[PDB]
């Protein structure tokens, strides 16, 4: 709900968690392809 | 604002900018100037600092002496332009009883870059720890250069120690003991190959600006830290698996002598903002409580960060945490960090357009970012113009001095993007110092113009703008609004070889006079000639050994009386799928002394340019991370058009699903229409309650007015709807948009209107470097690698696609055994297979049975080399071999 | 100016249903004249139909008609399908009155001089035991489809145009050098009063005549071949 | 009904699968026949063999694989699996 707009400090806190989702998503794709290969194997 | 020739861009800022944006190109200059120890640094540091500062090299000798002192630096050998032309390194030799020349010393341009072997490089500042966030040191360009010199000097003394013992005493001098090879080779080994030394990314002025200022985080660990406020931008980082590691410096970030980043802070005492702005490093930040930028200050005078936590000193302004690229996204406070990061990255992915239109709805950084990038011509001294020509501009300063500026005209950038400067001044114009004289590639009137302002409609249009696809009006092609020039460089060399010396000549062995029709007398394509895929650019010929020709060819030789020429053909043709006009030719000969690598006789390079119309398939995007390809381009006739008959330029589907939002995009679209049509609040008996927070200046505005809404301090929802209410009609006085920002559009095909009112407006979109012409690849047959006989992507083109392991799984899943076998054999590794297939295809015969893929044969050889006796046993044939 | 010779082909779907194709059209004339053709065929071809009817026994009774299985509503829907060509132009009042148990099939209605029913096998109603039914129905020529607007007089929706359902679609053909040439597909279902082919000629004739008003401003302009 | 097939989708796979065991057998079924037809248009089959077909009235420029599919749809040929 960014409709009202967030001040300086409010936006800083939001970045702390948003960056974890992008990094956590990087590990979701690697292992799934390493698992799918063993499955196929 | 505060700049002489600054254009009029009204701002919705409710807070004054107390401190002017620092020279955001200083991070590179200060460090290198401290390194070389320029007098400007000594004069600047002595005024408010230690009276005995030591230069980087001066400090290196201080610790090294006694084993060297007073090093010299002559004026630069050649000019930057002269270095980039001759492919040499912008350097100034340095000197140091016996005098010693240590080597050519690279130098930093005014743009904070280096010319290393004719290419413009940029050193990235590294942030290393001196644990906690504040414990980060941050090596500046000059400092991490000095450290590389330490290795050179120290190992140089290791050589002198060995030399003096074996050498006779008094029979040796500093010149005989000093072998500076490890010193000069240490700096040459840095600017090249070093991971911190990088080719300047410059397809738009902003890209190169953010390339500098960008820093490395490591010398969990990727997550942002409270300390990063006002220092490193958390909203800017690569999307790939390098997030967090790489980050761009904040706008107002300033580095202290050591390298510890400092942030501007205005100490707040007694609840009143003090104009005294002081440097507070990460550690010094906890000492005094820091106040929030957006604060309620009533008239004259008048949520804070704790020393170690969250929620004494006041912030200098908003966007301290934000970087330049991030600070240029209007309505940044509404978009999610993901899209904001996406938006910033795509801003530096834009390409310079031929027209370069400034954004209709922008922020504040445009003007400052453009002039600081270095791609815009600035007047050094107030005065008046004496001459204005497409080639150069001269200014007659009142002082009496006489300065001139040569303009980059169709200069190819590092990735083929054309950089063309336009003069914006006239003859008698009186210009002030620091003013803008000529526009850069992506600039207009001094401010960055990375895209164009287009009429948008946010309605789904018969599935052609599906998911992330976009549809454009053919007007964008006819009016060259999204047309961008792209220059390509080709090169060929003539050197000595094993059995002969290459000779670049016009005469080609087997060719018709038509194919050579566009070549000159020397054999190089004539200037201004149109070149299609496969045409010859430079005719080179190299010696061929014992001919041993085929008899079937010799017979035709005598029949048609064409003497089998002596040597082979080696001409430089245009890569497949490329085309354009020839701009310039650079010829470097040997008879003409010049200076080429040993064996090279002649060196010529041809530059080809292309005028790229915005084509279906190209990738467009806005400043809010929204991106998508061009799915279709309708003629202007069949396009949703307003009652004026004014067709819309692009039709964008509603990408933002709920929760996903992407709110910032919707805001600038409405403001885009406001700024395009002007407004007038029609104040009667006061002004509406929403305009109370507004400053007078935005009350009345004419059509096509540019607006500025700085990131966090920008227009607000209430003020918007109010501006929506005020909209100057067109010719005849009809109204095209209501207070909801919607309009009843007429389907240009059926002729009947669309049943519901559709949202229309003007959005600032960009043309991204991803281009169809560069990404379309097709291959029937082509070159094959040497070691592995697999289809190799020829340097011209024709690279084959990879059928990876996963694709094989999908092929096995279908059970298409034949299609799979076909791909891994006759289509790749089958030495005799792919030829007999092509043969069979031309004749129209059945395709033969696949053979043995060369990869497998190589496998057995690799095994045998490992002393593994492998035998491909038959059912009853015992052993077998390939052969 | 000269074009590329677009042709007009017709494929017969049924006895009263045929689809037409024009190939090739210049981008993007497919949609330009397309929607205008469907609009001309549907609401620009002259034809006679039923306007209002009155049935004996129903003046304030809304739902049912005694002695007949079909209700009031269902009875009207049948008569709407009645196709009759009347050149009288003005409202003519035909009469249909049959008694005794049986099936009234339009052929029972005596058409006044000037009107001719084209579907004599049409089922209008089924008759109950020892029951008679006298129906009077107004018929005046018209155009297109005019919705519905005296005691016991029931105005009914009027399907004036012979064309019953028309739809069109567009594709791309004619490779050569440019593969975005338009192909116009139009689907028209016609009542047996006039064939699909004639309907197109009437619609086409009325269009050219209608567009002759812009031509008369100057017959010397270039336009196209 | 299924309206009408356009190009590759004709004939339907369902009407073709009734002529063979599995979708895979259908592949080899039509594949080898296509090789037979194309041999016929050329000189077939070199020594000791004579090509047969097209059994059905070929289209204007119909591809031999597209012909073997129509032939299988009309039961014009029988096959034996090994
Ligand atoms: C991954 C990396 C550098 C990559 C080559 C580029 C960064 C990719 C991140 C991204 O663009 O999303 C790191 O670089 C340094 C040390 C370790 C790492 O090296 C690595 O892990 C790998 C390589 C490090 C240096 C390579 C130098 C040479 O390799 C080529 C030629 C030489 O320089 C390189 C040029 C890099 C310029 C890039 O600039 C970016 C865009 C493109 O990715 C490039 C044009 C611009 O967006 C610019 O603003 C961003 C610069 C990245 C700042 C990072 C500094 C730390 C080019 C690829």
């Amino acid at each position: 709900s960014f409709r009202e707009g967030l001040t300086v400090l409010e936006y800083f806190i939001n970045t702390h968690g948003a960056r974890k989702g992008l990094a956590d998503t990087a590990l979701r794709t690697a292992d799934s392809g390493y698992l799918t290969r063993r499955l196929v194997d | 604002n505060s700049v002489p020739g600054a254009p009029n861009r009204v701002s919705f800022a409710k807070l004054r900018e107390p401190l002017e944006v620092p020279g955001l190109l200083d991070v590179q200059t200060d460090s290198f100037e401290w390194l070389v120890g320029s007098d400007r640094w000594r004069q600047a540091a002595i005024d408010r600092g230690e009276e005995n500062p030591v230069g980087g090299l001066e400090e290196v000798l201080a610790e090294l002496s006694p084993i060297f002192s007073d090093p010299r630096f002559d004026e630069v050998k050649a000019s930057v332009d002269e270095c980039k032309d001759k492919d040499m390194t912008y350097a100034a030799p340095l000197f140091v009883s016996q005098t010693v020349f240590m080597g050519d010393f690279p130098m930093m341009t005014e743009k904070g870059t280096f010319i290393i072997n004719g290419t413009e490089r940029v050193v990235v500042s590294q942030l290393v720890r001196s644990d906690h966030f504040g414990n980060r040191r941050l090596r500046t360009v000059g400092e991490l250069i000095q450290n590389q010199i330490r290795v050179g000097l120290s190992r140089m003394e290791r050589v002198v120690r060995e030399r003096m013992t074996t050498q006779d005493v008094e029979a040796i001098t500093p010149q005989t003991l000093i072998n500076i090879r490890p010193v000069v080779a240490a700096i040459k080994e840095f600017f090249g190959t070093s991971q911190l030394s990088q080719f300047m990314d410059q397809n738009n002025p902003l890209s190169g600006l953010t390339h500098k200022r960008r820093l490395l985080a490591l010398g969990e660990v990727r997550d942002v830290h409270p300390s990063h406020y006002g220092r490193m931008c958390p909203i800017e980082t690569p999307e790939g698996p390098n997030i967090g590691l790489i980050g761009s410096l904040s706008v107002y970030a300033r580095v202290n002598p050591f390298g510890f980043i400092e942030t501007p802070y205005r100490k707040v005492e007694n609840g009143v903002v003090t104009d005294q702005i002081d440097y507070l490093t990460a550690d010094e930040e906890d000492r005094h409580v820091v106040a929030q930028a957006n604060s309620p200050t009533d008239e004259n005078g008048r949520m804070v960060r704790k020393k170690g936590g969250e929620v004494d000193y006041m912030d200098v302004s908003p966007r301290q945490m934000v970087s330049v690229a991030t600070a240029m996204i209007p309505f940044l406070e509404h978009d999610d960090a993901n899209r904001a990061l996406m938006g910033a990255n795509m801003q530096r992915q834009a390409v310079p357009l031929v027209r370069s239109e400034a954004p209709l709805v922008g922020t504040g950084m445009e003007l400052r970012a453009a002039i600081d990038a270095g791609d815009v011509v600035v007047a050094d001294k107030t005065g008046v113009i004496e001459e204005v020509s497409a080639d150069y501009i001269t200014v007659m300063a009142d002082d009496g001095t006489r300065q001139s500026y040569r303009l980059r005209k169709f200069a190819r950038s590092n990735h083929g993007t054309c950089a063309n400067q336009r003069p914006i001044v006239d003859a008698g114009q009186r210009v002030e110092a620091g003013q803008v004289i000529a526009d850069g590639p992506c600039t207009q009137n001094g401010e960055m113009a990375l895209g164009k302002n287009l009429l948008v409609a946010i309605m789904p249009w018969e599935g052609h703008n599906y998911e992330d696809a976009i549809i454009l009006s053919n007007r964008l092609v006819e009016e060259d609004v999204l047309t961008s020039i792209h220059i390509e460089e080709h090169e060929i060399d003539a050197r000595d070889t094993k059995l002969g010396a290459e000779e670049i000549t016009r005469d080609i062995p087997n060719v018709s006079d038509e194919v050579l029709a566009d070549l000159d007398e020397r054999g190089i394509v004539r200037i201004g000639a149109e070149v299609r895929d496969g045409d010859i650019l430079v005719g080179k010929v190299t010696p061929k050994g014992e001919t041993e020709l085929t008899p079937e060819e010799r017979l035709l030789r005598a029949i048609f009386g064409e003497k089998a020429r002596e040597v082979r053909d080696t001409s430089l043709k245009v890569p497949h799928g490329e085309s354009g006009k020839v701009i310039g030719i650079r010829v470097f000969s040997r008879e003409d002394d010049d200076e080429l690598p040993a064996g090279v006789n002649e060196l010529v390079r041809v530059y080809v340019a292309q005028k790229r119309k915005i084509s279906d398939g190209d990738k467009l995007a806005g400043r809010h991370g929204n991106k998508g390809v061009i799915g279709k381009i309708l003629p202007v006739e069949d396009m949703p058009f307003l009652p004026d008959g004014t067709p819309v330029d692009i039709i964008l589907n509603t990408h933002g699903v709920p929760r996903r939002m992407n709110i910032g995009q919707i805001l600038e679209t409405h403001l885009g229409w406001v700024a395009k049509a002007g407004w007038n609040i029609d104040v009667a008996a006061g002004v509406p309650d929403w305009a109370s927070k507004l400053p007078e200046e935005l009350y009345s505005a004419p059509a096509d007015s540019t607006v500025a809404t700085p990131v966090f301090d920008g227009a607000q929802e209430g003020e918007l709807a109010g501006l929506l209410g005020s909209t100057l009609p067109n010719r005849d006085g009809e109204v095209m948009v209501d207070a909801d920002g919607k309009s009843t559009l007429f389907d240009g095909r059926s002729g009947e209107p669309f049943p519901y009112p559709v949202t229309v407006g003007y959005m600032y979109i960009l043309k991204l470097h991803h281009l169809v012409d560069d990404k379309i690849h097709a291959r029937s047959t082509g070159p094959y690698s040497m070691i592995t006989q697999q289809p190799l992507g020829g340097k011209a083109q024709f690279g084959g696609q990879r059928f990876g392991e996963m694709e094989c799984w999908a092929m096995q899943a279908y059970g298409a055994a034949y299609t799979l076998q076909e791909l891994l054999t006759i289509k790749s590794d089958d030495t005799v297979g792919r030829v007999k297939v092509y043969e069979a295809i031309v004749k129209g015969e059945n395709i033969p049975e696949p053979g043995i893929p060369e990869s497998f044969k190589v496998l057995l050889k690799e095994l045998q080399s490992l002393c593994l006796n492998v035998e491909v046993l038959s059912s009853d044939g015992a052993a077998i071999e390939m052969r | 100016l000269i074009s590329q010779r677009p042709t007009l082909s017709e494929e017969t779907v049924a006895e009263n249903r045929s689809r037409f194709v024009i190939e090739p059209l210049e981008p993007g004339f497919g949609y330009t004249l397309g929607n205008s053709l469907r609009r001309t065929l549907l609401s620009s071809i002259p034809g006679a139909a039923v306007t209002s009817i009155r049935i004996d026994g129903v003046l304030h009774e809304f739902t049912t008609v005694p002695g007949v299985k079909e209700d009031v509503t269902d009875i009207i829907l049948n008569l709407k399908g009645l196709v009759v060509s009347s050149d009288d132009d003005e409202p003519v009042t035909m009469y249909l009155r049959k008694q005794g148990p049986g099936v009234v099939t339009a052929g029972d209605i005596v058409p006044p001089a000037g009107v001719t029913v084209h579907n004599p096998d049409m089922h209008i109603a089924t008759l109950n035991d020892k029951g008679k039914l006298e129906v009077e129905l107004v018929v005046e020529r018209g155009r297109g489809y005019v919705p519905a607007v005296e005691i016991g007089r029931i105005p009914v929706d009027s399907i004036y145009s012979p064309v019953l359902k028309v739809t069109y679609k567009v594709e791309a053909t004619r490779v050569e050098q440019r593969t975005d040439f338009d192909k116009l597909i139009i689907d028209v279902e016609t009542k047996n009063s006039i064939s699909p082919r004639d309907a197109l000629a009437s619609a086409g004739g009325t269009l050219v005549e209608l567009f002759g008003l812009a031509r008369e401003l100057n017959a010397d302009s270039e336009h196209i071949e | 009904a299924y309206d009408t097939p356009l190009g590759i989708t004709n004939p339907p796979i369902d009407e073709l699968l009734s002529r063979a065991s599995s979708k895979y057998a259908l592949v080899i079924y039509a594949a080898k026949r296509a090789r037979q037809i194309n041999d016929y248009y050329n000189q077939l089959g070199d020594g000791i063999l004579e090509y047969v077909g097209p059994l059905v009235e070929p289209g204007l420029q119909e591809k031999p694989l597209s012909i073997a599919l129509r032939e299988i749809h009309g039961d014009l040929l029988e096959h034996t699996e090994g």
Side-chain angles (χ1 to χ4, degrees), chain B residues 461-495 497-501 505-513 515-532 534-543 545 547-552 555-562 564-567 569-573:
Chain B
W461 201 89
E462 305 202 28
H464 281 282
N465 56 112
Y466 173 65
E467 294 204 82
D468 292 341
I470 307 176
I471 35 189
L472 314 188
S473 304
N474 198 33
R475 185 190 75 94
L476 307 183
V477 180
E478 303 181 9
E479 292 188 355
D480 278 323
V481 22
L482 289 185
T483 302
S484 65
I485 305 176
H486 295 282
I487 306 174
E488 214 60 32
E489 177 175 359
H490 303 70
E491 221 166 14
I492 197 59
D493 35 18
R495 319 180 184 190
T497 69
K498 26 173 166 293
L499 47 74
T505 166
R506 162 171 177 170
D507 199 322
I508 308 303
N510 307 87
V511 285
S512 175
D513 295 342
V515 302
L516 278 55
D518 283 24
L519 266 52
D520 72 338
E521 24 87 30
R522 304 131 54 191
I524 69 90
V525 55
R526 286 174 280 163
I527 311 84
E530 181 172 336
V531 295
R532 246 192 47 76
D535 293 342
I536 310 85
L537 294 181
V538 180
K540 170 179 180 174
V541 191
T542 55
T547 72
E548 185 56 45
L549 253 290
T550 63
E552 296 75 8
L555 177 51
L556 279 62
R557 294 298 186 180
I559 294 182
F560 294 91
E562 285 191 354
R565 209 170 192 185
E566 37 259 344
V567 301
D569 157 45
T570 122
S571 300
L572 171 50
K573 317 173 189 60

Side-chain angles (χ1 to χ4, degrees), chain A residues 2 4-19 21-23 25-26 32-40, chain B residues 222-226 228-229 233-237 243-244 293 304-305 318-319 321 332-338 340-341 663 712 805 809:
Chain A
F2 298 97
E4 273 113 337
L6 287 57
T7 37
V8 185
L9 290 68
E10 280 181 303
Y11 206 76
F12 197 136
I13 325 302
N14 198 114
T15 71
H16 236 275
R19 185 170 298 188
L22 282 53
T25 238
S32 191
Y34 171 61
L35 166 65
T36 305
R37 179 172 175 267
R38 284 179 290 170
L39 261 41
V40 176
Chain B
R222 301 176 177 267
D223 209 337
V224 321
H225 191 106
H228 299 179
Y229 185 96
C233 180
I235 317 300
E236 201 167 14
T237 182
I243 310 177
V304 291
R305 285 200 295 158
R319 83 206 189 191
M321 45 167 294
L332 174 62
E333 62 283 27
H334 299 270
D335 297 332
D336 192 27
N338 300 16
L341 204 195
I663 155 65
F712 293 151
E805 198 176 27
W809 295 342

Side-chain angles (χ1 to χ4, degrees), chain B residues 124 194-199 201 207 210-211 214 216 238 242 246 348:
Chain B
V124 184
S194 174
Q195 295 182 159
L196 277 179
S197 173
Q198 302 175 335
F199 288 169
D201 164 38
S207 66
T210 49
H211 189 179
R214 201 174 300 270
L216 215 179
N242 287 321
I246 305 171
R348 81 179 57 91

Side-chain angles (χ1 to χ4, degrees), chain B residues 104-128 130 134 139-155 159-160 162 164-166 169-171 173-174 176-180 182-219 222-230 232-254:
Chain B
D104 326 85
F105 201 75
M107 295 305 160
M108 171 182 299
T109 61
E110 14 272 333
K111 314 187 196 71
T113 71
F114 295 85
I115 286 69
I116 311 307
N117 308 139
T119 61
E120 193 163 3
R121 283 171 170 263
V122 175
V123 168
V124 184
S125 49
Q126 181 183 40
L127 178 49
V128 292
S130 57
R139 290 170 163 174
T140 61
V141 56
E143 295 172 50
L144 18 76
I145 281 291
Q146 153 187 144
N147 296 16
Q148 188 71 1
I149 282 185
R150 277 184 156 97
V151 174
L153 293 197
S154 295
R155 275 192 170 181
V159 169
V160 301
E162 203 293 326
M164 53 206 313
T165 73
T166 47
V169 306
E170 209 52 66
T173 200
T176 66
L177 294 180
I178 296 178
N179 210 77
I180 63 177
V183 179
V184 55
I187 43 198
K188 175 180 178 298
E189 231 262 31
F190 176 90
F191 283 106
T193 69
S194 174
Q195 295 182 159
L196 277 179
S197 173
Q198 302 175 335
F199 288 169
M200 177 180 173
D201 164 38
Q202 56 178 4
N203 45 237
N204 66 72
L206 194 165
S207 66
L209 180 57
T210 49
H211 189 179
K212 354 176 191 294
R213 307 198 58 183
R214 201 174 300 270
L215 60 120
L216 215 179
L218 190 283
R222 301 176 177 267
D223 209 337
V224 321
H225 191 106
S227 174
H228 299 179
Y229 185 96
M232 186 177 62
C233 180
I235 317 300
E236 201 167 14
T237 182
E239 304 184 22
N242 287 321
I243 310 177
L245 322 180
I246 305 171
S248 59
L249 189 77
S250 296
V251 177
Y252 305 81
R254 164 175 44 82

